[PDB]
């Protein structure tokens, strides 16, 4: 919640976008690993009674 | 001003080098996996499931 701070920060470059892309890649690869570990069969089997 | 520019460019270069090192570690892991697959599936019959 600052104005001059953002004006001085926008002169540094693409650090903001780089960090955002890194965090987004981390968040995507987390779900990728979660799917690769558990979701291995595309058919939900049910045990008989 | 020259010192500020040098510091900024050096920080950018160090960030690039760190990102390249991380990507190189990932690619090395993938290449080791690919070499293991080349040695097992191609040069033999791997009984490992999936």
From Swiss-Prot, chain A:
Phenotypic consequence of residue 20 to K: In strain: Omicron/BA.1, Omicron/BA.2, Omicron/BA.2.12.1, Omicron/BA.2.75, Omicron/BA.4, Omicron/BA.5, Omicron/BQ.1.1, Omicron/XBB.1.5, Omicron/EG.5.1
Top-level lineage group: Viruses
Known role: Precursor of the fusion protein processed in the biosynthesis of the S protein and the formation of virus particle. Mediates fusion of the virion and cellular membranes by functioning as a class I viral fusion protein. Contains two viral fusion peptides that are unmasked after cleavage. The S2/S2' cleavage occurs during virus entry at the cell membrane by host TMPRSS2 or during endocytosis by host CSTL.
Protein name: Spike protein S2
Phylogenetic lineage: Viruses, Riboviria, Orthornavirae, Pisuviricota, Pisoniviricetes
Part of the intact protein present: 745 to 793 of 1273
């Amino acid at each position: 919640d600052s104005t001059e701070c953002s004006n001085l920060l926008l002169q540094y470059g693409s650090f903001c976008t780089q960090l955002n892309r890194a965090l987004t890649g981390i968040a995507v690869e987390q779900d990728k690993n979660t799917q690769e570990v558990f979701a291995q069969v595309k058919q939900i089997y049910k045990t008989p009674p | 001003q020259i010192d500020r520019l040098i510091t900024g460019r050096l920080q950018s270069l160090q960030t690039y080098v760190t990102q390249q090192l991380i990507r190189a570690a990932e690619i090395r892991a993938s290449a080791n996996l690919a070499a293991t697959k080349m040695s097992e599936c191609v040069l033999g019959q791997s009984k490992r499931v999936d």
